[PDB]
Amino acid sequence: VPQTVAWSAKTGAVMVLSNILCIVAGRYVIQVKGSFAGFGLPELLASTSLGHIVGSGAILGLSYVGVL
Amino acid sequence: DFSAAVPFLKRPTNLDGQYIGDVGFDPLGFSDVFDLRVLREAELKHGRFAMLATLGFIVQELYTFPFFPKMAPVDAHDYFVKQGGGSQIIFWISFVELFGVVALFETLQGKREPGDFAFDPLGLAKDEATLERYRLAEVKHARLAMIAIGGFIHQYWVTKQTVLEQLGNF
Amino acid sequence: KKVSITVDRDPVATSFEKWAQPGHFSRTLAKGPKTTTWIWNLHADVHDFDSHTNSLEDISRKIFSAHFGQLSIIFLWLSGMYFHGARFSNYSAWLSNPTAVKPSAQVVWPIVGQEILNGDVGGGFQGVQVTSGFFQIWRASGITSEVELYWCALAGLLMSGLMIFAGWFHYHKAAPKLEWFQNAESMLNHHLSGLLGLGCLSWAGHQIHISLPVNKLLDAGVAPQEIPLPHEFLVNRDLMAQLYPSFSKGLVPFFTLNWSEYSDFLTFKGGLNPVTGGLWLSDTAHHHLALAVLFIVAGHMYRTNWGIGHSMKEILEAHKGPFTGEGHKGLYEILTTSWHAQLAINLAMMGSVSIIVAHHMYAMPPYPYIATDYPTQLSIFTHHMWIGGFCVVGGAAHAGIFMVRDYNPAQNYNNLLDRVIRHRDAIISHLNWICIFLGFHSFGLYIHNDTMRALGRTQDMFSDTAIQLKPVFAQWVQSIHTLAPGNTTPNALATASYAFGGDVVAVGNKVAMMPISLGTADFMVHHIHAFTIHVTVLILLKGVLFSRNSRLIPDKANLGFRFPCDGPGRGGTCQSSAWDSVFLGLFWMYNCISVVIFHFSWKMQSDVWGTVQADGTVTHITGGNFAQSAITINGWLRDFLWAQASQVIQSYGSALSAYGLIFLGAHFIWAFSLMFLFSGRGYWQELIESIVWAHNKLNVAPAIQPRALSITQGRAVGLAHYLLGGIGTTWAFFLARIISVG
Amino acid sequence: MPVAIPPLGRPETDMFDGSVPGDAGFDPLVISGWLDSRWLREAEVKHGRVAMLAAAGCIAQDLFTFPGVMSALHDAAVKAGSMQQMLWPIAILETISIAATIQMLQGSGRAPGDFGFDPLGLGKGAKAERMALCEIKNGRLAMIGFSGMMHHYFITGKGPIELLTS
Amino acid sequence: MDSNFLKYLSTAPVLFTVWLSFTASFIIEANRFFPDMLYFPM
Ligand code: CLA
Ligand code: CLA
Ligand code: CLA
Ligand code: CLA
Ligand SMILES: CC1=C(C#C/C(C)=C/C=C\C(C)=C\C=C\C=C(C)\C=C\C=C(/C)C#CC2=C(C)C[C@@H](O)CC2(C)C)C(C)(C)C[C@H](O)C1
Ligand SMILES: CC1=C(C#C/C(C)=C/C=C/C(C)=C/C=C/C=C(C)/C=C/C=C(C)/C=C/C2=C(C)CCCC2(C)C)C(C)(C)C[C@H](O)C1
Ligand SMILES: CC1=C(C/C=C(\C)CCC[C@H](C)CCC[C@H](C)CCCC(C)C)C(=O)c2ccccc2C1=O
Ligand code: SF4
């Protein structure tokens, strides 16, 4: 079984970083919606949902490879 | 506008008060899809069965015919399944229910009220106002006995005691 | 918003008037019969909604409500199976002794001696043995009593009533508008995330919370009556944690991404459960949970009222290259306007999925005690193979219907459809050549082997003891999949299936699964399969691509999808429609699926299924005769057809005698079909003229003038009785053989 | 008009027209602009009334118990079957509230949180609007207050007033 | 009873199915109460 870790501040840091990266990426690449003008609740929900998806994948992968 | 019984619900459009006992109570909207004549015939039939059932639980446990063994009414269903009286009662109810089918077809043609079987041999309703008053009384007793018969049967299933002994202790 | 709910209220009055007017839906048919042909026409075009009206909205409403009606029928059927399992089955005795009680959920009444069909099925029970696999499904679901089966039957009946009410409501009371139906993105989002995703998630919930503890107690040897009820597994976390200790940790490991804590009930074991011979239920629970996550993620792809999401029209129009002109442009309009194109795609996909189900369900048995239930395995493989073949040919048929009816060349200029039509001759010619090549170099190997074995030259045959045709690629793939645990799937304990290689998983002295080796005979029969599939594709694709016109008939689209001919001219134009191509492709599908199921039956009986005895040797049902006999047609005739039909022809006077009767009756219906297939309409019309004279002589000629069946109806009736006869013959033969010997 | 936070201003939605009771100009995520107004108002009033009953319950049960014997009370009353017997009438009342909220979203004359119930007559006339404000303010405070008493219980296994006096 | 429903019940497939089921039920009940009648007893 691949090693997963208990919740810590590192897990929170990775999740927060992935969420913020996905929020900025969603600001830049979403075609149909000063830089945060037009920023609405569905776009925030989509970006934070991708942020949990990317953060979960990154946390599981870094726990797999030993970076924790 | 709104229902007379439930003040925060709108009045169902097909509940205009033509049927005695109407307080505009239909939150699931059964009258919006189904024929109200059929629903009222079903309500009165279910209720009259339940009224006779509750009176039967009271009398049939107070008194029992000498030509029958003594047992509880719920066990009496299972006994008369095998003895053959229950088949006789089911047969005669079915026989009357064939003319009930004919009466329901007459109701759907608009030639008969949804509860009118023209059965008043003792002449108890003389004039109109008495008939509306007894209609409201019958509808209320029908609904009340429909709740009460389920109460009787389920409480016997849990306590294994009849109504009148359950009244004496707890 | 753009995606919204638009509904018309009370569009069609609920009335019995049109029930008394047969043919009301068609202006041609509403005039009433004058000939008997009308009657056939009344049953032939009735659910062909687009030919009754041109309004897409009314067609869509009819389709939605008919789908509700089909769902009601399916729910009634399921409720029937649950009820007949509850009341007329030996399911409790089977739960106590799965390896020795034959499943049976049908009991016949004694009338004319048919009570002999109530065979001694074990468990103190007499009935007809059933092979649908419902007992194994209910054991996998954790159903331990017949009371639960009664409640399941009630749930099925209630859902059937709900579906039929929904059909009446959504046609006759509140019919959605055309704009509601034309939301492909919203429908895909809801059906991917809500239907498949939440369905997988809730079934994973049932598997984790109900199926795993009950089946763990069953495999440990606990009697079904002493197993706790499922709600006790729900509320007593200590009882759950006795079997899986990670349940003591609750839902904290899920939300904190400490998922490995759940490794005791979410596993990646692979292989099979040694006690039951089925897949590990923990593996299935992780599987359905992972599928739920993937499906819910996939259900957020497509654009809806809010700005996020993909637009499928943009995706299609962006994918275009130098070989393909305008590319995938115009396909979104086709697939949002033509119901027949969607039916073509979905029927093709559902058929391919059913075929995949048959392969993957024999090879990795998913239910407890289903692997050693050989009649169930053979029945479900054959059944889902047949359903798959029928649905694939139906996808081709409704593709041809789209091409004749709904195709518009103005909206299809230089896109992929237009370019496919414009090089149809190259496509069909290359497919024709590859079909002839496959036929020669696959079937002529069998003919060559027949001749060599008949001429006494065994060293000149294609066999493993002779000139060899080794299936090296499939053997290499088998070696890879055997070497995969620990190397390319390092966290899997065992192989995905033991059919690729490994140990002999045996349950109750019967082989659940063992390696399925591939030799010269397997090479020849897989290339026979490739030949038959390519020829079926040739027939169906030639019919679809030449449905509108050809060099023979330049105005074929004006004649329609379904016409008998364009007359004896041009040399003869018989069977020129796309419908007739579907008619021939159904025969070739029958041939293909028949060879596939024969290969399956012989290979499993010869090399996989059997009894395990002392020193670990496996005695197979036919003793390994496939390697030397399946290389000739004589070997298929003698060692498979002649040898294994002994059980169905000696079934008279036993419980399996119904299979012998159905065997004879299916041979009869198949032969009866050849009267319709080989003959023509004019003979029967003149014979009917003479019979009409006979009835006219006695003044008993009918007012509805009797006519011979139409040419298309002659073909359709011959094909229907042919398929029924052949499939019924294989049905009776398979079932009698595998019930007797397995 | 009350501007809760001056840099972000007052959201331009169907809500914050000023007719809705209890508006402070506070909706920074602008959830009102994406979900219906009456649904959110009904949700707020129902959450507030349930939390008011909950906080009053925590205080009153810690003061006194009905004759005959927090989260442990939920577990022990489920084991007693009390919670099912309290789920059943609440379930009935909530199925009629399903009906009422469906009609209100369909556009009937019912205001959100209004169940037509005023036996004392304290609402009739000019009071109710202010009372509505009072209700919603108390409702919001209840959602804070109970949220203390449970999590505090999670720390101590102790009731909030009994924690306060100890 | 609705005349249109009766007219639907009078259609050829419904009446065919009902009449053939009725005939089949006669044959089945006759063979249930008097089985194995290879011959007319004389
Ligand atoms: C910090 C970043 C980070 C790191 C280090 C990792 C690291 C890892 N991830 Mg991970 N991941 C990340 C971010 C990260 N991920 C993000 C952001 C996501 C999105 C949510 C994912 C989603 C993800 C999934 C869903 C999975 C992983 C898995 C893995 C492990 C891969 C094991 C392996 O060899 O692959 C396997 C290598 C292969 C070659 C296998 C092939 C896989 C399939 C069967 C083939 C499908 C391709 C198909 C044929 C189509 C190709 C045809 C084409 C021509 C069209 C590895 C430890 C896997 C895992 O945990 O396994 C235990 C796994 O299932 N990751
Ligand atoms: C999450 C929402 C959702 C779900 C679950 C479905 C589900 C379904 N749709 Mg669908 N649909 C949706 C949204 C949804 N749709 C939307 C938004 C649109 C408009 C764009 C459509 C438009 C649409 C059309 C036009 C058609 C369907 C059809 C179907 C059925 C496919 C056949 C099948 O597999 O049935 C078997 C699967 C089942 C789950 C059987 C049970 C059926 C009931 C209705 C499920 C209800 C579940 C309920 C929501 C939650 C209760 C479960 C539990 C908590 C008690 C299936 C029931 C087809 C059909 O057959 O219509 C009748 C069809 O023709 N849908
Ligand atoms: C999702 C499934 C599906 C759906 C909804 C449709 C829908 C449709 N198809 Mg299609 N089709 C399908 C699957 C489907 N098909 C498959 C799988 C095939 C391949 C066999 C075909 C082959 C096909 C052809 C070749 C044609 C259609 C046609 C039609 C249209 C009218 C059908 C009609 O009125 O028949 C009314 C219903 C009947 C006549 C009942 C048929 C009864 C069958 C033949 C016998 C059943 C025997 C039974 C199973 C076992 C009996 C044994 C017992 C006696 C012992 C309609 C749009 C026709 C059309 O004109 O389209 C424009 C047309 O020409 N389809
Ligand atoms: C056993 C009966 C039988 C046989 C042998 C064939 C043979 C053939 N059919 Mg056919 N068909 C049949 C029954 C049969 N059909 C029936 C019952 C139907 C009714 C629905 C159809 C409907 C049908 C359609 C609709 C199509 C075919 C097609 C084909 C061809 C496939 C290409 C191929 O395999 O080339 C290889 C040839 C063979 C396997 C034939 C046997 C030759 C063997 C190998 C020995 C050769 C020895 C040599 C010639 C000896 C010379 C001796 C000298 C004295 C002459 C082929 C000519 C397809 C076609 O023509 O396109 C490709 C096509 O589209 N058939
Ligand atoms: C419709 C209608 C009617 C009505 C009505 C009803 C049912 C009236 C309901 C009135 C209520 C429930 C009023 C408000 C309660 C507010 C609370 C509990 C909020 C927070 C408490 C906190 C934070 C606390 C506390 C604390 C304390 C003290 C102690 C410790 O624990 C610690 C802590 C510091 C946390 C009637 C029938 C009358 C008729 C009328 O014509 C109209
Ligand atoms: C199987 C079996 C048998 C049996 C049996 C039978 C007959 C079993 C049970 C039957 C029935 C009818 C049960 C339920 C009855 C009524 C209920 C629940 C009413 C609730 C009313 C409420 C909540 C009112 C609420 C309300 C209130 C307060 C006022 C406002 C309105 C409303 C909101 C609606 C035998 C013995 C016959 C035969 C055999 O041997 C075995
Ligand atoms: C036999 C045959 C017929 C004759 C079939 C007749 C016309 C159809 C018979 C249908 C019957 C009347 C319906 C069902 C028959 C039942 C077994 C008994 C009759 C029931 C009556 C009450 C109608 C064709 O018309 C035909 C047309 C084209 C190619 C081949 C053929 C062909 O082979
Ligand atoms: S034989 Fe029949 S199908 Fe062929 S051309 Fe003549 S009429 Fe048409």
**A37: DSSP letter:** T
Of A5, A32, A56, the CB nearest to C307: A32
Backbone angles phi, psi at C461, to 5 degrees: -85, 165
**Chain B (21-80) residues lying within 8 Å, Cβ to Cβ, of chain D:** 27-28
Beta bridge partners of residue C720, listed in sequence order: none
What's the C591 CA to ligand 8 centre distance in angstroms? 26
Strand-pair category, C126-129 with C505-507: unpaired
Tell me how far apart the alpha carbons of residues C60 and C182 are, in angstroms, rounded to a whole number. 10
**End-to-end alpha-carbon separation of chain A, Å?**
15
Do C313 and C243 contact (CB within 8 A), yes or no?
Answer: no
Do B47 and B147 contact (CB within 8 A), yes or no?
Answer: no
CB neighbours of residue A53 within 10 Å: 15
Tell me how far apart the alpha carbons of residues C709 and C729 are, in angstroms, rounded to a whole number. 26
Q: Give whole-number Cα distances, C541 to C116, C401, C594, C716, in Å.
A: 49, 13, 21, 20
Q: Which atom of ligand 3 is nearest to the CA of C562?
A: 64
Q: Do C258 and A7 touch (CB under 8 A)?
A: yes
Contact list in A for residue D30 (CB cut-off 8 A) is: 40-41
Chain breaks in chain D (C to N over 2.5 A) after: 69
Alpha carbon A28 to chain centroid distance? 15
What's the B6 CA to ligand 8 centre distance in angstroms? 73
H, E, C per residue of C290-326: HHHHHHHHHCCCECCCCCCCECHHHHHHHCCCCCCCC
Torsion of CA C633, C636, C642, C647, to 10 degrees: -160
What's the C5 CA to ligand 2 centre distance in angstroms? 15
Beta bridge partners of residue C506, listed in sequence order: C511
> Does any CB of chain D come closer than 8 Å to the CB of residue B2?
yes
**C616: DSSP letter:** G
Asked whether at least 3 C-beta pairs link A and E within 8 Å, the reply is: no
Q: Between A and C, how many CB-CB pairs are < 8 A?
A: 41
Residues C570-601 as b or e (16 or more Cβ within 10 Å = b) = eeebebbbbbbbbbbbbbbbbebbbbbbbbbb
Tokens linked to C337? 């306007």
Nearest CA to D50 out of D132, D154, D139, D114 is that of D139
Q: Which ligand is nearest to the CA of D56?
A: 5
Do C537 and C297 contact (CB within 8 A), yes or no?
Answer: no
What's the D52 CA to ligand 5 centre distance in angstroms? 5
Tell me how far apart the alpha carbons of residues C538 and C268 are, in angstroms, rounded to a whole number. 42
Tell me how far apart the alpha carbons of residues C739 and C656 are, in angstroms, rounded to a whole number. 8
What's the A66 CA to ligand 1 centre distance in angstroms? 16
3-state helix, strand, coil in chain D (%, to 5): 60, 0, 40
Tell me how far apart the alpha carbons of residues C214 and C322 are, in angstroms, rounded to a whole number. 59
CB neighbours of residue C145 within 10 Å: 16
Q: Give the position of tokens 């729910």.
A: C75
Give the DSSP H/E element, type plus range, for residue C537. Answer: helix C520-545
**End-to-end alpha-carbon separation of chain C, Å?**
61
Do C73 and C87 contact (CB within 8 A), yes or no?
Answer: no
Subunit partners of chain D (3 or more CB pairs within 8 A): A, B
> Does any CB of chain A come closer than 8 Å to the CB of residue D30?
yes
Tokens linked to C89? 């089955």
Q: Is the dihedral of CA C484, C489, C490, C496 positive or negative?
A: negative
Q: Give whole-number Cα distances, C380 to C90, C371, C736, in Å.
A: 20, 12, 15
Tell me how far apart the alpha carbons of residues C465 and C520 are, in angstroms, rounded to a whole number. 10
Tell me how far apart the alpha carbons of residues C211 and C206 are, in angstroms, rounded to a whole number. 6
For the Cβ of C95 lying below 6 angstroms from any atom of ligand 4, the answer is no
Position D110: which residue type? R
What's the B145 CA to ligand 6 centre distance in angstroms? 9
Nearest CA to D48 out of D142, D112, D166, D150 is that of D142
Vertex C418: Cα angle to C412 and C419 (nearest 5): 145
Do B9 and D99 contact (CB within 8 A), yes or no?
Answer: yes
Residues C159-179 as b or e (16 or more Cβ within 10 Å = b) = bbeebbebbeebbbbebbbee
Position A53: which residue type? I
Q: Give whole-number Cα distances, E31 to C71, C127, E17, E27, in Å.
A: 39, 22, 21, 6
Tell me how far apart the alpha carbons of residues B148 and B142 are, in angstroms, rounded to a whole number. 10
CB neighbours of residue B136 within 10 Å: 13
Instruction: Give the CA radius of gyration of chain C.
Output: 29
Which of D8, D29, D31, D32 would you mutate first to test chain A, the one with the most A CBs within 10 A?
A: D29
Beta bridge partners of residue C106, listed in sequence order: C128
Beta bridge partners of residue C507, listed in sequence order: C510
Residue B84, sorted as left (phi over 0), alpha (psi -120 to 50) or beta, turns out to be left
Do C68 and C195 contact (CB within 8 A), yes or no?
Answer: no
Q: Which residues contact B85 (CB under 8 A, 6 or more apart)?
A: none
User: Which of C574, C576, C683, C713 to mutate to test ligand 8, by most ligand atoms within 8 A of the CB atom?
Assistant: C574
Do C122 and C101 contact (CB within 8 A), yes or no?
Answer: yes
Q: Environment class of residue D93 by beta-carbon count within 10 Å: exposed (0-12), middle (13-18) or buried (19+)?
A: exposed
Asked whether at least 3 C-beta pairs link D and E within 8 Å, the reply is: no
Do C419 and C324 contact (CB within 8 A), yes or no?
Answer: yes
The DSSP result for chain B, as a single string, is -B-SSSTTSBPPTT-SS-STT-----TT-HHHHS-HHHHHHHHHHHHHHHHHHHHHHHHHHH---TTS----HHHHHHHHHHHSHHHHHHHHHHHHHHHHHHHHHHHHTTSS-TT-----TT----SHHHHHHHHHHHHHHHHHHHHHHHHHHHHHHHH---HHHHHH--
Tokens linked to D21? 């009771």
**Chain D (49-108) residues lying within 8 Å, Cβ to Cβ, of chain B:** 95-96, 99-100, 103, 108
Give the DSSP H/E element, type plus range, for residue C147. Answer: helix C146-168
Alpha carbon C402 to chain centroid distance? 23
Q: Which residues contact C579 (CB under 8 A, 6 or more apart)?
A: C397, C400, C543, C561, C562, C563, C712
Do D32 and D15 contact (CB within 8 A), yes or no?
Answer: yes
Nearest CA to C725 out of C681, C684, C676, C656 is that of C676
User: Which amino acids bring their CB within 6 angstroms of ligand 3?
Assistant: C 43-48, 343, 347, 390-391, 393-394, 397-398, 401, 561-562, 579, 582, 586, 720, 724
Q: Give whole-number Cα distances, C488 to B113, C482, C491, C494, in Å.
A: 78, 10, 9, 12
Q: Report H helices in C88-105.
A: 91-96
Which of C17, C21, C704 would you mutate first to test chain E, the one with the most E CBs within 10 A?
A: C17
Backbone angles phi, psi at C709, to 5 degrees: -60, 145
Q: Report H helices in C88-127.
A: 91-96
Q: Which residues contact D101 (CB under 8 A, 6 or more apart)?
A: D39, D42
Q: Give whole-number Cα distances, C418 to C221, C314, C333, C401, C403, in Å.
A: 65, 20, 15, 16, 11
Which of D84, D92, D96 would you mutate first to test chain B, the one with the most B CBs within 10 A?
A: D96
Tokens linked to C388? 């798959």
The DSSP result for D56-113, as a single string, is HHHHHHHH---S---HHHHHHHHHHTHHHHHHHHHHHHHHHHHHHHHHHHHT-SPPTT
Q: Which ligand is nearest to the CA of C580?
A: 3
Q: Is C120 helix (H, G, I), strand (E, B) or coil?
A: strand
Backbone angles phi, psi at C506, to 5 degrees: -125, 135
Q: How many helices (H) and strands (E) does chain C have?
A: 30, 9
Instruction: Give the CA radius of gyration of chain A.
Output: 14
For residue C457, the number of C-alpha atoms closer than 13 Å in the C-beta half-sphere is 10
Do C520 and C464 contact (CB within 8 A), yes or no?
Answer: yes
Strand-pair category, C618-620 with C505-507: unpaired
Nearest CA to C6 out of C135, C186, C161 is that of C186
Closest-CA residue of A relative to D35 is A41
Position A54: which residue type? V
Contact list in C for residue E7 (CB cut-off 8 A) is: 19-20
Q: Give the position of tokens 């100009």.
A: D25
Tokens linked to C314? 């943009």
Nearest CA to C37 out of C584, C724, C696, C681 is that of C681
Give the DSSP H/E element, type plus range, for residue C727. Answer: helix C711-741
Q: How far D107 CA sits from the closest chain B CA (Å)?
A: 10
Q: Do C259 and A60 touch (CB under 8 A)?
A: yes
Beta bridge partners of residue B2, listed in sequence order: B10
Contact list in E for residue C20 (CB cut-off 8 A) is: 4-5, 7-8, 11
The DSSP result for C391-443, as a single string, is HHHHHHHHHHHHHHHT--GGG-SSSHHHHHHHTHHHHHHHHHHHHHHHHHHHH
Of C22, C111, C112, the CB nearest to E11: C22
Q: Give the position of tokens 């009634």.
A: C76
Closest-CA residue of E relative to C20 is E8
Tokens linked to B137? 């009384």
Tell me how far apart the alpha carbons of residues D77 and D72 are, in angstroms, rounded to a whole number. 8
Tokens linked to C249? 């940790």
Q: Is C610 helix (H, G, I), strand (E, B) or coil?
A: strand
> Does any CB of chain E come closer than 8 Å to the CB of residue C112?
yes
**C639: DSSP letter:** I
Experimental method reported for this structure: cryo-EM
Tell me how far apart the alpha carbons of residues C547 and C581 are, in angstroms, rounded to a whole number. 9
Nearest CA to C733 out of C668, C667, C671 is that of C667
Tokens linked to B8? 């925060």
Backbone angles phi, psi at C271, to 5 degrees: 65, -145
Subunit partners of chain C (3 or more CB pairs within 8 A): A, E
Position C252: which residue type? V
Tokens linked to C293? 């996550």
Beta bridge partners of residue C104, listed in sequence order: C129
Do C342 and C406 contact (CB within 8 A), yes or no?
Answer: no
Beta bridge partners of residue C126, listed in sequence order: C120
H, E, C per residue of B23-51: CCCCCCCHHHHCCHHHHHHHHHHHHHHHH
Beta bridge partners of residue C705, listed in sequence order: C35
What resolution in Å is listed for this PDB structure?
Answer: 2.1
Q: Do C20 and E4 touch (CB under 8 A)?
A: yes
Tell me how far apart the alpha carbons of residues C97 and C584 are, in angstroms, rounded to a whole number. 48
Tell me how far apart the alpha carbons of residues C366 and C215 are, in angstroms, rounded to a whole number. 13
**Chain E (1-42) residues lying within 8 Å, Cβ to Cβ, of chain C:** 2, 4-5, 7-8, 11, 28, 31-32, 35
CB neighbours of residue C722 within 10 Å: 21
Give the DSSP H/E element, type plus range, for residue C590. Answer: helix C578-603
Tell me how far apart the alpha carbons of residues C718 and B22 are, in angstroms, rounded to a whole number. 63
User: Which amino acids bring their CB within 6 angstroms of ligand 2?
Assistant: C 64, 67-68, 71, 181, 183, 186-187, 190-191, 194-195
Q: Environment class of residue C548 by beta-carbon count within 10 Å: exposed (0-12), middle (13-18) or buried (19+)?
A: buried
Residues E5-38 as b or e (16 or more Cβ within 10 Å = b) = eeebeeeeeeeeeeeeeeeeeeeeeeeeeeeeee
Strand-pair category, C610-612 with C119-120: unpaired
Position C340: which residue type? H
Tell me how far apart the alpha carbons of residues C252 and C272 are, in angstroms, rounded to a whole number. 31
Position A37: which residue type? A
Tokens linked to C427? 């496509």
Q: Which residues contact E5 (CB under 8 A, 6 or more apart)?
A: C16, C19, C20
Nearest CA to B19 out of B137, B124, B136 is that of B136
Do C607 and C521 contact (CB within 8 A), yes or no?
Answer: no
Beta bridge partners of residue C119, listed in sequence order: C127
Residue C427, sorted as left (phi over 0), alpha (psi -120 to 50) or beta, turns out to be alpha
Tell me how far apart the alpha carbons of residues C618 and E2 are, in angstroms, rounded to a whole number. 69
Tokens linked to A32? 């149909």
User: Which amino acids bring their CB within 6 angstroms of ligand 7?
Assistant: C 675-676, 679-681, 684, 708-709, 714
**End-to-end alpha-carbon separation of chain E, Å?**
49
What's the C389 CA to ligand 7 centre distance in angstroms? 28
Give the DSSP H/E element, type plus range, for residue C106. Answer: strand C104-106
Residues D38-62 as b or e (16 or more Cβ within 10 Å = b) = bebbbebbbebeebbebbeebbeeb
For the Cβ of A67 lying below 6 angstroms from any atom of ligand 1, the answer is no
Tokens linked to B105? 């077809």
Residues C499-536 as b or e (16 or more Cβ within 10 Å = b) = bbbbebbbbeebbbbbbbbbbbbbbbbebbbebbbbbb
Tokens linked to A31? 């075609």
Taking each helix axis from N to C terminus, what angle separates C339-363 and C374-405, rounded to the nearest 10 degrees? 160
Nearest CA to C224 out of C154, C152, C153, C135 is that of C135
Backbone angles phi, psi at C544, to 5 degrees: -70, -45
Tell me how far apart the alpha carbons of residues D77 and D65 are, in angstroms, rounded to a whole number. 14
Nearest CA to C81 out of C91, C67, C95 is that of C91
Q: Which residues contact C634 (CB under 8 A, 6 or more apart)?
A: C450, C453, C454
